């Protein structure tokens, strides 16, 4: 049930309800003659929400507020980007065009600009190091070193233990690591292994594409990336 690029018409949108106040969101995007599916994460906080990553893109990401504003009905009135390619930050000038307040690592923010992207408005600070780890509302945002990207952050949900992995996590059907040209494969092993030890406890663990599942698509990540 949970939704793929057969089943998401590109421009379109799709929430799928994770645990108690957490939903994904799932939108597509076609690169080169290629499509794919992104996901993101939403998160409750009393009568607001959380947004984790754009929808890939302005029109996507137009579609994931009105998406969330038919089922859910709470205005998104912060975001976190959880690293600086366009699945993660494109779309942010529609956040900030909805009054949404959008953040990243000081180091995204950097990367974003340097790449030509979309740049979130405002820096999480004390996140600088491999290990920090920060609240922020309902959730919990992680800098566990470079993998995908060096500035790739994971987030937690504690009260119902949701870890949203991003990028730095392959979904299982994975076998190769997809774009590589701005990670650290040589660190991606340690990265992971500071999840696993950080977030013993997680019940379901969400890729930045593709099928959510548990903890074991952790040890397949570093798996998939020794080659
Ligand atoms: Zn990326
Ligand atoms: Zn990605």
Redesign the pocket.
């Given at each position: 049930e949970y939704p793929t690029v057969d089943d998401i018409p590109v421009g379109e949108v799709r929430l799928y309800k994770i645990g108690d106040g957490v939903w994904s969101h799932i939108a597509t995007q076609k690169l080169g003659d290629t499509v794919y599916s992104?996901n993101g994460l939403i998160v409750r906080d009393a009568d607001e929400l959380l947004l984790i990553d754009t929808a890939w893109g302005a029109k996507n990401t137009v579609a994931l507020l009105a998406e969330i504003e038919k089922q859910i009905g709470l205005p998104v009135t912060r975001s976190i980007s959880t690293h600086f390619?366009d699945?993660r930050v494109g779309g942010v000038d529609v956040l900030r065009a909805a009054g949404v307040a959008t953040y990243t690592s000081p180091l995204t923010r950097q990367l974003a600009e340097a790449a030509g992207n979309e740049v979130p408005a405002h820096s999480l600070k004390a996140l600088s190091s491999s290990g920090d780890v920060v609240r922020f509302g309902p959730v919990e945002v992680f800098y566990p070193g470079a993998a995908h990207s060096g500035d790739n952050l994971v987030v937690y949900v504690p009260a119902v233990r949701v870890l949203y992995g991003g990028?730095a996590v392959h979904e299982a059907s994975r076998e190769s690591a997809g774009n590589v040209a701005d990670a650290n494969l040589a660190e991606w092993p340690a990265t992971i292994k500071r999840i696993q030890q950080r977030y013993p406890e997680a019940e379901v663990v969400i890729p930045?594409?593709g099928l959510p599942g548990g903890l074991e698509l952790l040890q397949h990540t570093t798996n998939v990336v020794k080659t």
């Amino acid at each position: 049930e949970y939704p793929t690029v057969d089943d998401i018409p590109v421009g379109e949108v799709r929430l799928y309800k994770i645990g108690d106040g957490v939903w994904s969101h799932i939108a597509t995007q076609k690169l080169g003659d290629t499509v794919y599916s992104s996901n993101g994460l939403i998160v409750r906080d009393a009568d607001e929400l959380l947004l984790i990553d754009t929808a890939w893109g302005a029109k996507n990401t137009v579609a994931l507020l009105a998406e969330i504003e038919k089922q859910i009905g709470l205005p998104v009135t912060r975001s976190i980007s959880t690293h600086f390619h366009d699945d993660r930050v494109g779309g942010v000038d529609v956040l900030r065009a909805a009054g949404v307040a959008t953040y990243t690592s000081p180091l995204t923010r950097q990367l974003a600009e340097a790449a030509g992207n979309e740049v979130p408005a405002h820096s999480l600070k004390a996140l600088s190091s491999s290990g920090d780890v920060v609240r922020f509302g309902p959730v919990e945002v992680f800098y566990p070193g470079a993998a995908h990207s060096g500035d790739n952050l994971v987030v937690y949900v504690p009260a119902v233990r949701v870890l949203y992995g991003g990028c730095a996590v392959h979904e299982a059907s994975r076998e190769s690591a997809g774009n590589v040209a701005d990670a650290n494969l040589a660190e991606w092993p340690a990265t992971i292994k500071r999840i696993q030890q950080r977030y013993p406890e997680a019940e379901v663990v969400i890729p930045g594409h593709g099928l959510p599942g548990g903890l074991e698509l952790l040890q397949h990540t570093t798996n998939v990336v020794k080659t």
